[PDB]
């Protein structure tokens, strides 16, 4: 089966509700599996001396009208996070496209410096294709994903902390 994981958002403080991630481990099994594995922090604690785990991150870097990233968990500004592998991590494939609003895909410093960090497309991202690794999609709360993007702005600065509460496998 492909995994399905969940972040349970909050806005502020607030509840904004869950986001639930199909990821691709048919396709790009590493990818997912680092991923997963950030999820439920079966890992422990990595060489950073963080919990390899999403719980407690905030999304830093949110644009209305693109994107919604997340993921570094050492730093939380985006110069930061670590992969299960290591630092970081190779280009898995690029078999899947940023096709739609709710892709799931890596974010990175260039080729192959895949870590910890994501992001949730909401609009189609063809620009973005052969560039970062897509590995999964949302499929429930997207609702969740468009509350997120409205305290971004274009520069990326969040009005609100959008913070992934709970996070995990089901």
Same mark, same amino acid.
């Given at each position: 089966?492909?995994?399905? =994981?969940? #972040?349970?958002?909050?806005? $502020? /403080?607030?509840?904004?509700?869950? &986001?639930?991630?199909?990821?691709?481990?048919?396709?790009?099994?590493?990818?997912?599996? !680092?991923?997963?594995?950030?999820?439920? /922090?079966?890992?422990? =604690?990595?060489?950073?001396? *963080?919990?390899?785990?999403?719980?407690?991150?905030?999304?830093?870097?949110?644009?209305?009208? #693109?994107?919604?990233?997340?993921?570094?968990? +050492?730093?939380?500004?985006?110069?930061?996070?670590? %992969?299960?592998?290591?630092?970081?991590?190779?280009? @898995?494939?690029?078999?899947?496209?940023?096709?739609?609003?709710?892709?799931?895909?890596?974010? !990175?410093? $260039?080729? !192959?410096? !895949?870590?910890?960090?994501?992001? &949730?497309? +909401?609009?189609?991202?063809?620009?973005?294709?052969?560039?970062?690794?897509?590995?999964?999609?949302?499929? @429930?709360?997207?609702?969740?994903? *468009?509350?997120? @993007?409205?305290? $971004?702005?274009?520069? /990326? +600065?969040? %009005?609100?902390?959008?913070?992934?509460?709970?996070? $995990?496998?089901?």
């Amino acid at each position: 089966a492909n995994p399905r =994981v969940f #972040f349970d958002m909050t806005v $502020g /403080g607030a509840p904004a509700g869950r &986001i639930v991630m199909e990821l691709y481990k048919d396709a790009v099994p590493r990818t997912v599996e !680092n991923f997963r594995a950030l999820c439920t /922090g079966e890992k422990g =604690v990595g060489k950073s001396g *963080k919990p390899l785990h999403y719980k407690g991150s905030a999304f830093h870097r949110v644009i209305p009208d #693109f994107m919604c990233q997340g993921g570094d968990f +050492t730093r939380g500004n985006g110069t930061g996070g670590e %992969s299960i592998y290591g630092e970081k991590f190779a280009d @898995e494939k690029f078999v899947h496209k940023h096709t739609k609003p709710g892709i799931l895909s890596m974010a !990175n410093a $260039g080729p !192959n410096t !895949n870590g910890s960090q994501f992001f &949730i497309c +909401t609009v189609p991202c063809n620009w973005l294709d052969g560039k970062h690794v897509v590995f999964g999609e949302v499929v @429930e709360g997207m609702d969740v994903v *468009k509350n997120i @993007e409205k305290v $971004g702005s274009r520069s /990326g +600065t969040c %009005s609100k902390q959008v913070v992934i509460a709970d996070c $995990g496998q089901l």
